[PDB]
Amino acid sequence: DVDTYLSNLQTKTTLSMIADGLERSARDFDAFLEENVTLEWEAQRKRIYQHFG
Amino acid sequence: GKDLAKMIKEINDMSNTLSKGSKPDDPLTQIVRVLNGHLAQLQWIDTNAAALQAKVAAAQK
Amino acid sequence: AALIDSAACSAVPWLGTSEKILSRVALAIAQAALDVYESTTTWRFRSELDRSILVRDVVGLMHKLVVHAHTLSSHLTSTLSPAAAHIISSFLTPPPSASSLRFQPLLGTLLVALITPRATLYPGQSRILAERVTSVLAFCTSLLRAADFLGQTHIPLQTHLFQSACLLARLPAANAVYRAPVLELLRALVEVAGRAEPPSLLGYLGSHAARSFISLVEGIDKPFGRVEHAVVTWRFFAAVIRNRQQWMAGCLLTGRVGEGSVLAAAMERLREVKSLDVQEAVAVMDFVVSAQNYWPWTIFAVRKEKEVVDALRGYVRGLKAPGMVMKTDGAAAAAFQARIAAYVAETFAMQLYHMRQMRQAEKFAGELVADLDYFLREGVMVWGYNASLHGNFARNFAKRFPGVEVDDFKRTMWLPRELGKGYYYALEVAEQMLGFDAGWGGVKQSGFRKEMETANLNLSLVEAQVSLFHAWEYLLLELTLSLLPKKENAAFARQVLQVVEQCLEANQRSQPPENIFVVLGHARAGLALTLLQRLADANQLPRDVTHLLALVSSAIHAVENPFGANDLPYFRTLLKILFVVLRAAKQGVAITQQVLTILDRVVARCFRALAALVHTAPEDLALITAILQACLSVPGIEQCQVQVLNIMAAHDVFQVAVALFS
Amino acid sequence: TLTDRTYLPPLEDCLTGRTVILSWRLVASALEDADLARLTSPALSTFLRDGFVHELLKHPARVFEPKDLKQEFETKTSSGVDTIKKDALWLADAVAINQVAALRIVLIEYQTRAHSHLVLPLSTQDVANIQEAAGILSLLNPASAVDAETMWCDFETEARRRERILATYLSERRSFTAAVDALVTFLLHSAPGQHKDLDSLRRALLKDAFAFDEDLDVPDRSKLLTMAPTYMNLVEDCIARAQALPAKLGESFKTEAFELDWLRTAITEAVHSLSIAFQALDLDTPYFAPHELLSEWFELMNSSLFLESILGFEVVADLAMPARSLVSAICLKMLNIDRTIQFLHDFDYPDGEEPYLLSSQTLNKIHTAVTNAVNSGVAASLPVAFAWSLIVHQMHLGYQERASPYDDFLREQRLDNDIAPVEQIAMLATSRGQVYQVMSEMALCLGTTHEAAFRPAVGARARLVFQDLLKRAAYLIPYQDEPVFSLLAILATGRQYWDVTDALSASSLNQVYTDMLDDETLFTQFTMQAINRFPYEFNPFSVLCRVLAAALITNKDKADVV
Amino acid sequence: DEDELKQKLQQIDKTLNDPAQGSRLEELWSRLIVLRGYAEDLKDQINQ
Question: Alpha helix (H) ranges present in D142-195?
Fold first, then answer.
């Protein structure tokens, strides 16, 4: 385990890698909003399908 | 040289383990490595061939 | 030197003087002192003590001149500004012909000190040489800091300071007194080598000499165990590790794992923080973080191999760390405890990130989440700024000192700000600058000194709170991903909701100043944003928006409506926060009356402002559209459609929409 | 129930580094710099508060007296230890010290190898870097400089290791002497207004070692007054080792450098012993010291030629001058010219202690010692000889008025009828103002200025004997410029203008100054005459006003005298 | 011809025995260990 950990290690500050979580969140939020608005359009269409009958 | 070799080895270890570390027996690092080998050999070919090409200009007197 | 010291007190006896006269006299004095310093390297004294005293005096004068110029940034330090400026221009970027004439005196002093024999007699000469060495070291440090400041990219003095450190590595061997000053100098040289690979220090020191110096300094004041020299050696180690030094860092961490390395003793000190002085604990934790962020593979490995002694002590510290410690016995220890907790949280977060990368962070995180009580108490809440006493002190100082203001004592960032009573206000200088007239001393240790000390302690506490904020933000951000499974959901959701509520309440309550600390706008909004994001991805919310949205609405109402102003990130993050909040509400009636305010006053106003400005805009308009779409989906709206028809028709949004569509 | 646990911690701690033994170097440094944090540190606090360290510092001879502690050595060395034990045994076989002290010194040297290596000559790369920096300043030695590899390979050798061990042993001896001296100084002449922790530590150390309690109206000086012979007897072994190196030591190590180092160490130890004795003596200024000890001390000085045999070399002048000054100071102290004249003129018994005045043998010994010293042609004996001459000049007249034990002395060496020898000695001493010049030099080396060889309090308490000598000698020899310049160089010492501070210190340190305004002899003869000779004789009055204004800044009772 | 030999030897020996050249490696090693720890941490974090 330690062998692979040292093999795949990069010379750089650790506090910068964890920071990437912010970027990843900012890039996931977009897709999450797109899923919100798609499940919303879906819901709306559904309620219309239950309005017409 | 020995210490430098150790360093390079460790760098390889860290890069390889960082990029992938849940299957060190996988075919990706394989392709990577072999493909690096090919790159190096191709570079050798290119450079040496260029050298020989340069060597011909001397005979063009 | 006495003339310069007297001129330093520019806050006052002085009939017959003026700023220009004092400035010219100070410039002439600086020129004369520099000429003497350049000429002393040629005179032949009957003995070495005379030259030593002369060098000590000139170095002390130059140091007092340099520090006085950068210690403050107000007009009080303008009388000696042409002089300090001259000395700095002449000791940082001298001509190449006379560059060595200004450096040979220091080299000769270091040589004479490193080859003076040890003697039990003649204590006068010994103390004079010690003071001379300390003055030279302080002057070197001041020059290094001055070069680091003002944006100096090419420092020709660094080449000589390296070969001077070559001697300073052995100089402490003659006298232990030099161990702290020397290390300080080295720390400042390393700092100048960071913001400027650097010249390899191992090439100047040497393998054997470097190993001897490391073996001498690794033990932090073991025979006595003082706090000053300890914080000094811990800051030195942190600075040496933070820079690109790699050979020295490896020899200092490994010790040639670690058996006699600095870390072997740092763990021994960490396992007794419950009784150790909080002042040294901060420096020890800073060293730990500096060794972890740059050399994690060693520090984290050793800590996991010995976690049975560190995790227990961390849990003990966390459980018995009250939030409001001001009211109890102790006022200055609050900032120290907050800084210690912030460093502990940062280290926990880093080790949890490493374990997650190694896929061994489940049990450790599950055991640590039960220790976040101190965080829930004094974490994201930064309302401990107590602007009341700060404003009172400012008014009392402006009423008694019309000319000098309270903000004039702000540090110029020349030296790393201490997390003590001198974080923002320069007390070391104020003590000698305002102590000439009655009012500073005060009866029964009262007056302006105690109030300034309390204000500095409060500012240090706020800084520690911000550090803990960042640490806990990272920790919770990684834990939200770690604790994805369906377990410990109750306490987890409770903690997240409490954090969000504390953030939203602090966003409304009194804000801190923007000139002292960093603007909080957009700094603590994304935190709650990503928290609610991940909690919605997990779908484990108690649909308790009935009260959570009130704070967001109050913030959106009392934000001055900077829809398109410079505060665009703040507006966007507030919009995303309200979006996720109203989406969580949709998953859940008394909700419609509480959510119609955003549909009536917020969405319409922002849409009209955007339509009027557009005559940046695309993403904001898309976000507003998504907000309205997700807000029109709440179940409470399918019945209040009648009630909302009029509010939606009053603004005639359809006209502007069709216009922009054209 | 006095073990060496805190004194000599287990070898496992010394080797693993978990507890660095508080060597005498660190204690001496902390006591010399008067650092608050170090002196109040837990480690040093527990080390000094232990009764074992108290008994050791009260009996330094036992710290190096040859004893048979083979059992203790084996028990300590059992439960890199082989090399440590071998070095300890070799050192114990070479020097007469016990095996425990040798083992402790070897452990301290092992812990201090970093310093011993860093104080070595630099490598070739360092010399090259220094030359590059230089572009006067020629304090290097490139002709002998070598690389680091050959410097380290030679450092780990056996001969070099033994030489470093011996050097560390000598350094630790000097550090122990300086540390005990500074400790006695701080315990006897503690400055006021110090931190509460320092006062508490002082009171604890006193009550534990000497039972000296400040709340008692009469503290127990017995255990503090018994520290004079404890070091006057060790000075014998010091001079014996100075005049003869260890025989069991290998001849290969007995090189010029080693001989010079041994001589310097012996001189430093003798100076520290003399200073400790002077301190223990001035602790009780008015009362006399036991004549049984002064007899032996004067016999010792007679035999050793006032340490002029070991100080006769020209390579120990820097250490000889202060050594001679301190010898003269302690001689004048034990002589008590002031109290001696008071007793000879008052005839009342002091009751503090019996003086040598009632023993004719001691008087004969002192007289023959002074005669031998003056015949040998040495300057260090100038003030002591002059003083003794004055005493004899007062005894002669005391006999003329009575024409009792001193009569035996006066008639034993044929000193009753003729007064030629002492008069000739005084004439030679006063010729060319040699006595005054040597006294001024001693005061300079025993003052408070940065040129002084000892601490400020040491010189402040050492100038008292010279001031008393000038007091009693002032009414004998008339007023003249030489004695005045001598007293000026004594009281002022030649310090600078910025050497004046308002730092409040113990009254004892201010005694040497206030005496000028306390005793009528030093008031109506020097101060009054100096004021009267103004501005004609400007330097005396000026320097007197300067020193008075510099010394009486905090003394509110005499702040308006200048 | 010894002079030429020791000249070459001195040149290469001088080139090797330099503070900077010797320091670069030491600096590099730590400079690597930084990335080692950073990568290992960021790896453990994204070890899912």
Answer: 148-155, 158-188
How far is C494 from C490, CA to CA, in rounded Å? 6
Alpha-helix residue ranges (DSSP H) falling in D95-157: 99-111, 113-118, 124-133, 148-155
Residue that the structure tokens 């001897």 belong to: C212
Measured CA to CA, the distance from residue D221 to residue D279 in angstroms comes to 13
d(CA C593, CA E7): 93
Beta bridge partners of E44: C358
Long-range contacts of C565-574 (CB under 8 A, 24+ apart): C567/C521, C567/C522, C568/C616, C568/C620, C569/C521, C569/C522, C570/C521, C570/C522, C570/C525, C571/C620, C572/C619, C572/C620, C572/C623, C573/C522, C573/C525, C573/C526, C573/C529, C574/C525
Please, what's the b/e burial string for C213-237 (b: 16 or more CB within 10 A of its CB; e: otherwise)? bbbbbbbbbebbbbeebbbbbbbbb
Give this entry's resolution in angstroms: 37.0
A14–C579 CB contact, under 8 Å: no
Tokens 């955007």 — which residue? C610
Under the phi-then-psi rule, with left for phi > 0, alpha for psi from -120 to 50, and beta for the rest, what region is D313? beta
The experimental method behind these coordinates is: cryo-EM
CA distance E24 to chain A (A): 15
Q: Burial level of C128, CB count in 10 A (0-12/13-18/19+)?
A: middle
Q: Which residue has 């997700």 as its token pair?
A: C630
Secondary structure of chain E: what % helix, strand, coil (to 5)?
A: 90, 0, 10
Interchain CB distance below 8 Å, E37 and C198: no
Taking the CA of residue B27 and the nearest CA in chain E, the distance in Å comes to 20
Q: B15: nearest CA in chain A?
A: A8
Q: What distance in Å separates the CA atoms of residue D275 and residue D295, rounded to the nearest whole number?
A: 19
Structure tokens given for D89: 């045994």
CB of C257 less than 8 A from some CB of E: no
- For C646, other C-beta atoms within 10 Å of its C-beta total 9
Q: Do A22 and C358 touch (CB under 8 A)?
A: no
Query: Chain E residues with CB inside 8 Å of D125's CB?
Result: 17, 19
d(CA A25, CA C477): 10
Q: Distance between CA C527 and CA C568 in Å, rounded? A: 17
Q: How many residues does chain A have?
A: 53
